[PDB]
Structures are given as C-alpha cells and as structure tokens.
Design a protein around this ligand. Sequence first.
Ligand code: SF4
Ligand code: SF4
Ligand code: SF4
Ligand code: SF4
Ligand code: FCO
Ligand code: FCO
Ligand code: F3S
Ligand code: F3S
Ligand SMILES: [Mg+2]
Ligand SMILES: [Mg+2]
Ligand SMILES: [Mg+2]
Ligand code: NI
Ligand code: NI
Lengths: 267, 268, 551, 551
Amino acid sequence: QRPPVIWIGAQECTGCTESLLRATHPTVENLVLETISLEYHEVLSAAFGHQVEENKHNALEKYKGQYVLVVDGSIPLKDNGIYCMVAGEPIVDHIRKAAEGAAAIIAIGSCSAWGGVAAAGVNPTGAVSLQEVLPGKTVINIPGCPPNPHNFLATVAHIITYGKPPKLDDKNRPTFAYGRLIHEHCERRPHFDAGRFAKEFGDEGHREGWCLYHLGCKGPETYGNCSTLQFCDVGGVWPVAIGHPCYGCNEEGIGFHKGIHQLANVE
Amino acid sequence: PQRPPVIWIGAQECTGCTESLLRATHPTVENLVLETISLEYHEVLSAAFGHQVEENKHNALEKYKGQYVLVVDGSIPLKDNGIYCMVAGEPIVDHIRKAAEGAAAIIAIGSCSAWGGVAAAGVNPTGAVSLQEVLPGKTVINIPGCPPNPHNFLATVAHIITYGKPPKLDDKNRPTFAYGRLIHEHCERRPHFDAGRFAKEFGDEGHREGWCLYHLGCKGPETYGNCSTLQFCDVGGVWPVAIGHPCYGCNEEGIGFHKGIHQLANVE
Amino acid sequence: SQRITIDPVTRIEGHLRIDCEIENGVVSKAWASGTMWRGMEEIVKNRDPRDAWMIVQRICGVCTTTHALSSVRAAESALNIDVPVNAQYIRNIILAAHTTHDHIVHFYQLSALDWVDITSALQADPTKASEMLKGVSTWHLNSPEEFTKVQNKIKDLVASGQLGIFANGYWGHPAMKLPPEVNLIAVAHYLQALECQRDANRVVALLGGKTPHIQNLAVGGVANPINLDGLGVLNLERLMYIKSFIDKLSDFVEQVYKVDTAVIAAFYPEWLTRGKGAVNYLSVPEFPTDSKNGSFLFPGGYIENADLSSYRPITSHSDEYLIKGIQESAKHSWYKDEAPQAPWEGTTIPAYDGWSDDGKYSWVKSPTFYGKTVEVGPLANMLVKLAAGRESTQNKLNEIVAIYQKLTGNTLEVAQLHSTLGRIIGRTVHCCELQDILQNQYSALITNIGKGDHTTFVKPNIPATGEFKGVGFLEAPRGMLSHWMVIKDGIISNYQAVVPSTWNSGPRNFNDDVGPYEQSLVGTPVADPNKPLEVVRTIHSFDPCMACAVH
Amino acid sequence: SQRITIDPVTRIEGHLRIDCEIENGVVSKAWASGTMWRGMEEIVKNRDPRDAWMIVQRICGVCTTTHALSSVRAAESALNIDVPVNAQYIRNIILAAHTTHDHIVHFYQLSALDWVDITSALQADPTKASEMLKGVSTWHLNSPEEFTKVQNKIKDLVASGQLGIFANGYWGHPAMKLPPEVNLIAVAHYLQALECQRDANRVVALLGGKTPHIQNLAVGGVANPINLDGLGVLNLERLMYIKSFIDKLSDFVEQVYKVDTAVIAAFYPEWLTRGKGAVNYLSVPEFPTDSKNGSFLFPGGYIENADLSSYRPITSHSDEYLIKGIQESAKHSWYKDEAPQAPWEGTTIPAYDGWSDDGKYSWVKSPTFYGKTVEVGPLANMLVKLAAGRESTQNKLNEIVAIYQKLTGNTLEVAQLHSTLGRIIGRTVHCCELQDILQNQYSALITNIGKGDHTTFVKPNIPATGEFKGVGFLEAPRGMLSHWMVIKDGIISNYQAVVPSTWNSGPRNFNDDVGPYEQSLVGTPVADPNKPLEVVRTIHSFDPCMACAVH
Ligand code: SF4
Ligand code: SF4
Ligand code: SF4
Ligand code: SF4
Ligand code: FCO
Ligand code: FCO
Ligand code: F3S
Ligand code: F3S
Ligand SMILES: [Mg+2]
Ligand SMILES: [Mg+2]
Ligand SMILES: [Mg+2]
Ligand code: NI
Ligand code: NI
C-alpha cells in the first residue's frame, strides 16, 4: 500500500504539476506507480465529472487522517469565492473540506505559498495563500514559480520515510531548499565582489559570465536553492547561469512586484 | 560521410583520461566513435592486438598524414633513454614524436601529459615530462585535470572539426572556455568565504551547512578550471567542493600533487 | 431527453465545465464554460513594457514559453524592434522543443485514456501485441518482453487495490473498441512517452534557464550570452549538450506517436465523421529566420467555409488584414462590456451573475474574425499548410494515411480531417514536422555563430510620451496566440491576450453563434449519459487549456 | 619451437607484452611483462599519511576508487582508527557501484571482441536472433527492431571504409564460433552496456564528487556532510537521486550480462578446460558494516590446492595469518633487491637491464603467500564464497548454469570453473551480487541517518615521533589489494602496494615458479601464430591492469 495524496488546483497555471514531468528522482511515472497513491489529480485522472468527484469523496473517507493534501494556485476570496468554481462550488470549500482529514498540507508554488502572481498588482480576485484559508492548520510552503519538483518530492519523501516533515524556517519552508539567500550561495559572487558586472545582455561582461546584480538580480533578497540544486538535473541550468537575473519568483514582495531591472537591496 | 581521424597514444597513463569518455554524454563514447570521429588507434578499445594493431597505426599515419588529431595521456619518461615506457620494443617518446610529425592538431589530455602531473611529482623517479616538452617545435593544446571533464576535451575536438581551428587558448595553451578563470573566482561558496563562514573539520556544523572549504585546504584560489560550473558527470551539483571536499588543485602545476590536501592556498 | 453536466472535465489544463442536452441518445446542444478567472490582463497593466513577459508567461504552465514569447513580440511590435537573428534561432528552438513535449503529453497523458482501456490490457497476449506492429513500426521498444513488463506494472497496480489516477475510469464502456493487445501497446507507449517529453524539455531548459517558465527572453532578444570561448556562458560544449537532446526526440515521435495516431484512427473510423467545430480556420506563420521578424519556416493563413483552394495566405505578423479582423465579445461571458471589441480597445470588467443557458455562462470571451467563428490549432495549422501546398505537410499526412490504409484497407480524404480524429492527426503532423524545425534552427545557429555573429540583444528605448500599439502573434501548440499591448506615457495602458483556447472554447458570441467546442459536440452519440465518454473524446481533441482561455 | 610476441596486448588497462614459445601449435611456455613503470610508491613517500590516498588513487583510473580506499584503510590501520559506520556505507556504495561499471566494461568493451565477430553479425537475421533468446531472458531490448538498428550501425561503419577500433580484428578466425545471430546479439548488448555502466558511475559521482578519481575520502572517514535539512550538502534529495541510479542497474546486469555470460560459455565449452592459472586462491572479506572496520557483507579466505572443503576463512582485515604470509620478489623483475620481501620491509629500486628469458623481463614484482603462487580476483572470490557455503553465490552461479543447461543440455561442475570461462563466470556472479550490496547499503544508510547518526569523520592524530605500520586490504574488481604504510616521525617512510594484477601477472618468482598468467597459457592451442587470439582470450579473462600491476 502506498501513501495517499490528494491534489487540488485552485487558481493554478498547471506549472506546478508540470514540474513533476521534469523530475528524475522520482520520475512522475515512478511517483504515481511506486512512491505514492495519487488518489485525486484532475490533470491525469482517467475519471471525469461525477466519477472523479466520487473518487475524491471515497478517498477522503477511506484515507481520513492519512493523506497528504497538496494545493497549487491561489485561492480567490472576493465575491464569495466565485472566481474559481468546480462542480458548482467555490474551490475554497473543496480545499477546507479536504484539509479536515489531511495528515499533512503542502502549498506547492508561490501562488499557494503566498498568493504569487495571481494575487499581484490590484489583485482582481482577492487571491490569497493556502495558509490564509487554513488558519488553524500547519501549511508547508514550497515556493517558486514553479519550484524545482524535488523541493516538493523530497519533502513528501521525508514525511513518508521518517514520519514527519523536514525542518522548516519561520515561513514553514523546508530549510534544505529555502534555508539560504541565493546570493549567499551564488557562483557569481566573486564577480559581484570584484565589481565585475554585466550592464546589458550581450555586453562583454555578460558574455564572460559576470554578476547580474546591475541587470536587476534579486538573488540578494530571495531565499532558495536555484544556484545549487538548479533545474532539470542536466547540470548548470538556472536563470543566472543561462544569463538572466533572478526575478525573485520564490519570494513574497519581490517576484511579480519589482521590475526585472529594478535593483535589489543588499543586506 | 568520412569522419575526422584521431590517433590516441597512452604513455605513463593510469587510463583515467580515457575512462573520462565513458562518463561523457555529449557525445557519448559510442556516438564519439561511430558518428563524431574515426578513432583509428586506441589500445584500450581496439579489436586488433600486437602486430595487427601496429599495422593499424602505420596505415593510419600514412593514409591520414596532415589530417589526424593526435591525443596523448600520461607523462613521457626521458630518464635512462626512455625505457620506463616501452611499447613494441621501443620507447613511447619515439612513437609519440613519429605520430606528431603528421598531426593536424596535438592534444595533451590530463595533467600528466599537460604538465607532468602526479607521475612527474616529488622525486620524479622516471624523469617524466609533459607532451609539450617532448615536442618543442609543435603547438600542444593542454586539457589538464586528473582527469578533466571529458567535454573539456570533446568540445575542443568539436571546435577543430566544426570551425576548422582550435578554441581560444590561454598562455598555457589551455582552452579559455574551460580554464580561463580561477575556480575561486566562480565558486558558489564565495559568499561563505567572504563572511568568514568556514568548515574547520569534515563533519562539523559549518561543513554540514555547505560553508567554504578554504580552511580545509581548498586550492580553488590558485587553480584554473571549470569544476564549479561545468562540474562532472552531467547529473547536476557534482564537483569535489559541492560533495564536501576541498579542491586539491589537480588541474594546476605546482598545486595538485605538490601541496598537501590540508595545506592552505595563497589568495590573490 | 436530458441535461448533463461534466464538471470538472479532467485531463485538460485548467477548470472546464461542459453541459449537454441529450435527445434520443445524441447531444442536441452544448455549453462550454471556463470556471476560473485570475485577471492576468489587469495584473500586468501599468507596468514597464519590458516586465510584461515574466508576468503573463504565468497565464499557463502547460503552454509555458508561449505567453512569454508572444509578450516580447508584442512589445517589439509596438516599439519597432528588429530581433537579432540568433535570438530568433534560440526562441524558435525553445518553442519547437516545448511544443514537442506538449503534443506528446496531450496524446498520451491527457487523451489516450479516452480510447484505451487498461483493464482490457490485462487480458492481452504480449507476443500477439508485438506481432501486430510488424511492418507498421521500426520502434525498438515494442518487444513482447517490454509489453510483459508493462502488463505486470498494470497487474500490480490493480492488485494493490489503489488505482489512483486510473480509478473509476471508463473500463468496459461500449465506446471502448481496442482489442486487449492494442490497449497494452498504448499503455506501454504512454510510459515511454514520459521519457521523450523529458528530453524535449531538457532542450528547453538548456536555453531557457529552466522549465516550466523560461527566463531567457527580453524585449530586444534573449539573455543567452553566445561565446564559444567563454566559461559559464553559451559555448560550444553547452550547444553540443542541447544537440544531444534534440537528436533523442525523433525516433519516438516518428515510430511511436505517429504510428499510434494511425492505429487509433484505424480502430475508431466513425470518429472521422464527427467533431467538426467550424468551417473557418486560422493559423499564423511561425519560426522567423531573418533579421526583421519574418521569413517564417511554417506558413499561416485563413480558410473560409472549408475551401482550401481559395484560402488567404498570411506571411507577416504585421499583416493588417489579420490584425483588423480580430475582435472579442462578452455577451455570453461574465464581463460587463458586451459589444465586439478590437483587443487594443478591449476591457475585462468582471460581471459574474451566475450561470444562465441564455445569458452569461463562462469566463471565456467569444472571439471572431471579421464577425465569424473560427477554429484555431493543429487542425487549422495542418489545413493551412495543405492549402499552401507545403510538401513536408502533405508527405507527413500521407505517411499516417499509409499506415491507416495498411491497417484498414481504406484511405483518408481531406474531407474526413474536419473531425475529432482529423484534429488529433493535425497535432501529430505538427509534432513530426517540428523535429525538422529543431534540426534546421540548431544548424542555423551553429553556422551563424561560425560567421562571427554573437549578437543576441538590442537594448530597447521606450518613449516617455506618445501612444504605441503592438501585437505579438505566435502559433502555439493549441493555435494562434496574440498579445495586444498599448503603451502610453512609457507604461502599459492596456493589455489584452486572445488565446487559442479562447477561440475554440469561447461561448455563444454577440450574434449567439456557437463556438468550436459547442458546435463540435452536436450529434455526439452518448451510450450512457451518466458516463459521457464520447463528449470528452471530442472536447479533448481540441487540447483545452482554460488558464489560457480565460487568463 | 616458434617464438611469438604480443606487444601491445590491447583491450586491457596499461602496457602489457606477452611472449610465447609454441611447439607444434600449442603454447609450451609464456612470459608476462609489464613494460611501463612510474614509481608511485616512491612518489608518495615522505608525505603526510593523510595525503597518500589522493596520490596513490592515480595508480589506476580503470579501478578508480580502489587505491584511494585501500590507502585510507592503511593509514587507519597504522593509526588505530575506527571508521564511522556512515563512512563505511558510503565507501561501500562507491566501491560496489564502481565495480559494477568496471565488470560490465570488461565483459563488453574489453573482452567481447575476442569471442564475437562483427563481420559475421552483418549476415544475421535479426528476427532469428531475437527468437534465440525466448525463455532465456526477459530483457526489454532484444527485439528484432533493436537488432536491426544495431546491424545497420555496423553496416554503415563497414561501408564507410573507416573501421577505426574495429579495423583488422580477428573476423573469420577459426576460433570464432558464434553463429551470425549471436554475434549480432552481443554487439547490441555491447552498445546497451555503455548506458548501464554510465548509470553505475552516476552513483559513484554523487558520493565521490566525480569519477574518474573520487574526492570524498579521508583518513578518518569521508568528506560527505550528512544533513537531511541542509542546503548544498548530502540531504534526502541527493540520497533520492543516488537511489534513482542504483535502481537502474539491476535489469541489465541480470537480464543481459548474466545471460550473455551463459551464452558465451554455451558456444565455447572447450574454454572450460583451459586457462587454469593456479591451484591456490585468495580473497579478502569486503563491505564492512560495523563501527570497528569489520562485519563484512562478503567473506574472504584462502584455498590451497583447489580444495574448497578445507579452505581457511578470513573474516578480519587485521588477520595476522594473512598479513604475515604476503611477500614479493624481484628475481625476474627490473628491481635490485631480489629476495622475497614482506611489504612493510619492501624496496622498489629500479634495475632495468633489458629483456632476458631467464633473467629479468618485467616491471611487475612476484607475490607469494607463504611461498606459494596464488590467483586473486573474481575466480578466487567466487570459489571462496562457494567454500564458505554462501547461498547467494551458489544461487547466482546456479542461475548461470541453468541458462547454460537450457542452451547445451549440460551442467557445469566446480572443477570446470578452474578455467578461462570459470574466471569470466566468477566476475559475472560478482557483478550480480553487488546489486544486492548496493540496495543493502543504501537502506542501511537511510536507516542509520533516521536514528540520528550523521557522523562521517573522526579526525586523526599522528604522533610526531615513533615508527608504526598499517595495512589496508580491499577486495577490488581484479582481486585482493593491499597498501602497506610505514610512518616514521609523522611522515610516510615506506609505502608498498601489492595489487591484484601484481599477483596474477607477476613473472617467475624467487624459486622460478610460474605465476597465473604464465601458467594459464601452457597448453593453449594457437591456430595461427601470427594472430594468437587464443592467448589473448585467456589473458583477457584475468582483466589485466598493468598500471595497477606495476605502479
Ligand atoms: S506558482 Fe507559478 S507555476 Fe505554480 S501555479 Fe502559480 S503561476 Fe503557476
Ligand atoms: S547579484 Fe545575483 S548573480 Fe550577482 S552574485 Fe548575487 S545572486 Fe549571483
Ligand atoms: S591526468 Fe590523472 S587521470 Fe589522466 S593519466 Fe594522469 S593520473 Fe591518470
Ligand atoms: S576557498 Fe574553495 S570553497 Fe571557498 S570560495 Fe574559494 S574555491 Fe570555493
Ligand atoms: N497552446 C497553448 Fe495555451 C492555449 N490555449 C496558449 O497560447
Ligand atoms: N581492480 C583493480 Fe586495479 C588491479 N589489478 C587494483 O587494485
Ligand atoms: S526567479 Fe525564481 S526560479 Fe530561482 S532564480 Fe529566482 S527564485
Ligand atoms: S582537485 Fe581537480 S577536479 Fe577540479 S575541483 Fe580541483 S581542479
Ligand atoms: Mg546593448
Ligand atoms: Mg483576453
Ligand atoms: Mg608494489
Ligand atoms: Ni495553456
Ligand atoms: Ni587498475
């Protein structure tokens, strides 16, 4: 028997699910066949409509107290929740019901972790975070837009393998992935230190792999593991390594708030 | 289509430089030998042995005169008239000088052929020297490391094939794309260095938080290479420092195999 | 007769509700409803034009890359910027590799379980299954041994009593027509597909900096620093790595996906006679290869009343005929302003009043082209290519038809492509032709770098006064995408996205005309109204993306 | 008689010359010669004991990891350090995964072209080839389609006129006995092998920091920082990654390598009756799992005169019987001191005087165990395991024999393992059992970390005066390895490596007794003395590593 997981998408772009299709340890096929039982996920479920609704209810009863609940996307509270309606009911209600019986609750992605892009600017739909919708519950936050999928998978594995969540910071983010500023573990720090800065994409310094601070890099104010774990498990692939500043997508008040080329505050 | 010919001669080699190729992914060793090049001589993989493989060498040197890339791993021992490495009854230095005569390009892969390496270290029992030292009239492209990331070699070969000339080289004839910068001038633990956050012993708290390894003897400050960026094995996040061990300076003459693991580097 | 609701529709991107009236076992009328809105157009407003792409990329994570690219193209359109050719090659490789991933995942992970019964696969003889593909495919992973491994995984899943994503599927449904052996073949291919799509996205990641959500674009070109001799930048070693993944895509695409497309058609030939959504089709040209945002590798055009012979070519993203035709209405949508709006003058003012069959029933707007309803996406794209006389497209379609003929003894005519299966076929053809796009553009990049051109970025200037309008067109996996940006006093004063799934999924329009999803369902036989598999088959053929449709 | 020289012997590590006297087409006498020396023992002298491992690892890059591990074990022996159990788990995973790579490459890339004729493979019927393996293997990549792809690669290579590594091979030689179909099977497996060995080394890299030449050891334990909650260190994500590669090895090992071993034996049964190198065998126990450098997963022992029933178990790396038995002579080697030397008292003084049949003819020394010649390596290691009654080893051999029986109708007895093919079989059995070592030690590590033990390193103290001595044993891919370190006034005053290929390849000893390579060749039929394939077949079975043998 494999540990049950219930995944509900709110105001999601599906990028957080799509992260799983890049994963290698486990791959998505090994995740769903070997590591977990994915009891509800609308992107992959064979069942639709009334049949998939049955699966949800069956799973909530059968696995009460045992399942991991995962939510991607923000939860819109404006106008009584009507900005995201599934089977005729506000998504906030589906989420609160599923949270009642959850052994652990995970907000995957910046949207569910802190509102993200969906809650930015004038916030048209009154989008909020999963934690805000579940004030009485401990929500594990795995931010990023989307996070490296292993930030999520290794959190789930810790719960399964050792019976408890990984250590968390004071935003309930796992320390193994979010315990340090990108700029406090970035391979271009020597260039920063020496005043060796890209000024425009395609200039000489940029073409020598210099620091991207003056292009608006938000590494100095963003917690994450983008410089170390990086992305896609091919080696050497993260925004800065490719030539673009960090935008702060992990970090509330940075990504989707500050302009790309706006300079970060350095501690 | 015809593939560009390569002749590979091992001198005082441990075979790690060849073995690097079996970790490569772009190209994989099977695609290297079937699609990218024609590997006309390599003793580790050649079906032919003895007199037959000797014929292959001679035939290749004649047929591809002026066209082939010559590659050497290992140091070349000059002490006692070359007898510390004898193949088919002749000193390896002679085989190498002969093959160099017709080479379009000449590559020392690994620290041993690049600058003598471990084999030439300390008392240097066999009077081991670098490829460049045995070929004073030739431009030798040096691809150091013990062994280098195989793509440091493969991308150099690809540049020669694709664009008809070597990649840009530094004043040690090392390709700049791989050896153009100190490891410490592109190391992700520089912030920790800068803050005085240092591992003091393996297994201590700082070490277990991924702090800088300077005080464990990291030679990143005096070693040129791409270990922090390209890293190794194409899995992501794998190089000595990332795994928890200081750079030993294996790329760099006078560092690797000279300084102790725990001896401190000079910082510029 | 009766009224059914399918909510949620699964195995799509996003939140979709489908309602159907059924009369005498056949759908008589349908409603498509996007049930989630974010207001991404409003979120991006009032910002610097350069910042838009990183925000609006988050319209969708399935069709990641596409909104980013459309956004920078829109800004470049407004500002009159000619993108460096290297930046085009890189943009093109990303889009082509992304779309490869996208299409493979759609056919297998999203669509196959409409046509494939995993339970029936347990009864298959693996050897017979393998034998069925002799002379049909040269794929190296169709052995009885492969099929046995796959069958045992299904066996173990079922035995565990934890079906998960497979629970309560349509196993045994009368519309399921594959023999056990072909069901097993499909499940094996479903699992193999996951490796191929992973390789496609490794291409994307090495140029984009990650995927989902690339981070290498700019208004003015790309952030990739081309330097063959540079450490830490886009050098020959990194390019070789990209190439190694490009080369891993073709075999699966050609020997599995393409073949399975013909196989499904062969067993479900009635599905070539239903699921027609429109008589008009639009696509834009794609993959520009010159220094002036043109010279596209793929052609675009407009087909009216299904007449390929008199289609109108579109060879430029500045084509005023295309630009001037496009409007959107919110008469039957949950927005305030209902009259058709050109997107430069568009508004997006929420006005939710609940569901009404005759009133507002969707967050999706209703696009028209010169007042007509239009289908976009792979069917449109293939038909336009056939109308253009594109030999590569006719040849690739012919290969699929040749397999179908081998299996059935029948041929396919163009008339039969205006269907659920025709739509699926168009997508497959696209995936196949994209492999040549990748080879072509990788080669172009290597060659251009060799001539000494390492330019990737032209820094924009943005006047602090004046009003400038720009449109960025892109032929996305699900069809023609357009981002419409108005700049006034240096900032975005209006932003409107008109997205392919908006065209196809949009509700009844200003004249109460029916959009493609709604039209395609009329006449769908439904054996069991409680389990309307037949409806979902047709809807899935459009590859719905509702985060896209609504934004 | 006729005199032949094979120089260089290819498809080994390092520089080897083999000479043979042939009488009426049978080898009557042989000489093995290591023709390259570096003096690695002298290079490492007069250094801090902690520095040795990074230097002496470079004895060999084929058996990378092994000299590094033996060196730290030797220093730990001298200093009386008990290695933390987590350090043992990590060392064990590296060694097991390394050896997996090593053995796979030996069977395919180094050995197969002695037995396999690529020209003949061009004549194969791929379907017949696939059919031959029904009920012999469940491997998923034995389809006719796979075999056809492989056959076409060979065809294209031959047609190119550039055979490269395949040029002037022993195609059509009378000793080549495989039918076209089995030749094609082997070439397919040769190419597939390269992916499996790559996955094995991904395991090694993630713990070692790279491979070749790991960089995670220390005198005192390992440099890996265990912290499940740490960024940039060995956390659960990294461990999961390691596990993903561990899991990818088994199927190829079990369904291809193991099966091919039986297939080669089935077609070459005469090779079970020649190539006996010795009557005595040694192996050391390996993979310690306690906190005191003991509790090995694999047993060791000494077999005398081929009598398993009376073998002597070795269960400790501190075994005085083992330690005191080992000596080396340079009577027929190019060193000055000729009398047998215990390695703590060893010298390595070069004294090259050219080749002489009756004098000195090798850079390899001549090891003895209590004055006897001994074979080390996988044959020794298997025989010792069988003598120990290790069920896992008997079961794994029985599986190989069952396949052989299916193909030939015959069984194999232990007497037939004292042979070229027995030696190959021992290596295969080792590779198979190592997969269980990997699973076992990964689980042990995860469990131990879960109990709160994150310790990895015990810092040594090294007295600045006094003279003291240590020995590090390791069961390497090619057999028992020992590093012998004497420390005086805090630095290395003597360093002697006695390496498995030293045992096997060593020349005639102090009493002119013949070592395993030289003995194994007596009786070898040679059809064509110009092309002595038969000789190379037997020599290759020992997996020669001459950088190892000589150092
Ligand atoms: S966090 Fe980013 S990727 Fe995930 S749902 Fe939100 S917008 Fe999409
Ligand atoms: S500003 Fe950005 S690129 Fe520069 S060192 Fe900091 S995180 Fe790295
Ligand atoms: S450079 Fe290192 S890996 Fe290469 S031959 Fe020398 S010792 Fe071996
Ligand atoms: S001393 Fe070593 S670990 Fe520290 S910043 Fe420099 S190269 Fe990195
Ligand atoms: N493809 C795609 Fe997404 C949709 N519809 C966009 O654009
Ligand atoms: N295996 C190995 Fe190398 C040899 N002989 C060592 O030790
Ligand atoms: S934009 Fe996001 S993905 Fe990492 S590099 Fe910055 S936190
Ligand atoms: S020891 Fe060598 S492999 Fe790189 S990290 Fe230092 S140069
Ligand atoms: Mg500029
Ligand atoms: Mg819109
Ligand atoms: Mg020795
Ligand atoms: Ni989309
Ligand atoms: Ni070796």
